[PDB]
Design a protein around this ligand. Structure first.
Ligand SMILES: C[C@H]1COCCN1CCCn1nc(-c2ccc(Cl)c(C#Cc3ccc(Cl)c(CNCc4ccccc4)c3)c2)c2c1CCN(C(=O)C(N)=O)C2
Length: 223
């Protein structure tokens, strides 16, 4: 059976909330967040990964445009191809497009593979959050109510399943019966609940939370 509630912050799998600023690189933050959890699960160490490394290096060849958008799946593919990603400390975030400055000397994580989940399947997303860890997702975050979100379970009747902002699902639960997905955003700690947004769960793919989910993996050999 799946636990009724999950919070990956309780297992020390979630780094501090980041502030993307005037750079449309939510995709890079969503991708690093998911891999940070895997790095902790596999080694026991929590280290922030370089979103800047994705912005500057996972570019045209990955269908990404740095500060003008991108995708978590192709960000994972770049990490696979590159044989690593630098730590955030070694390659810091500047909220702007720069020349690729990857340095294998400061590589903090690898990626073996990535898995995409079926569209709108909140049951499959719940299973992946429980058994695999934090899942990279897109959400419809265009509505004034998302921008004005302070606390509780976010429900927007005007929300669509067409995603426009990359976030990280780090858990799930319920607020006195109102089911939610625990979401890590990249708008700093002053957004919502210390940088988190709890979004309506099992409400017909509310805001397209389960439209395009993906998660990376770090494999330990094989048999
Ligand atoms: C095209 C091929 C080739 O190349 C690599 C892989 N690829 C993607 C294939 C799968 N696939 N994956 C996503 C997907 C997954 C995750 C995210 Cl995050 C986004 C996004 C976005 C986005 C869209 C518009 C804007 Cl303007 C912005 C910028 N942010 C604006 C903003 C809004 C609200 C608050 C703040 C900022 C981001 C999109 C989508 C799709 C299919 C079409 N999509 C939709 O039908 C939808 N839409 O569901 C979106």
């Amino acid at each position: 059976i799946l636990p009724d509630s999950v919070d990956w912050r309780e297992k020390g799998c979630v780094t501090e909330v980041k502030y993307q600023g005037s750079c449309g690189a939510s995709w890079a933050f969503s991708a690093v967040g998911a891999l940070e959890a895997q790095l902790k699960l596999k080694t026991g160490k929590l280290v922030s990964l370089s979103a800047q490394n994705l912005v500057d290096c996972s570019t045209e060849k990955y269908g990404n445009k740095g500060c003008n958008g991108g995708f978590m799946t192709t960000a994972f593919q770049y990490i696979i191809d590159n044989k690593g990603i630098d730590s955030d400390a070694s390659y810091p975030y500047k909220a702007m497009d720069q020349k690729c400055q990857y340095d294998s000397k400061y590589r903090a994580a690898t990626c073996s593979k990535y898995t995409e989940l079926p569209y709108g399947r909140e049951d499959v997303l719940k299973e992946a959050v429980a058994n695999k860890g934090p899942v990279s997702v897109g959400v419809d975050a265009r509505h004034p109510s998302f921008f004005l979100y302070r606390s509780g379970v976010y429900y927007e009747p005007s929300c669509t399943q067409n995603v426009n902002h990359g976030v990280l699902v780090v858990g799930y639960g319920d607020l006195n019966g109102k089911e939610y997905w625990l979401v890590k955003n990249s708008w700093g700690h002053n957004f919502g609940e210390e940088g988190y947004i709890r979004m309506a769960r099992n409400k017909g793919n509310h805001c397209g939370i389960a439209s395009f989910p993906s998660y990376p993996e770090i494999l330990q050999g094989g048999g």
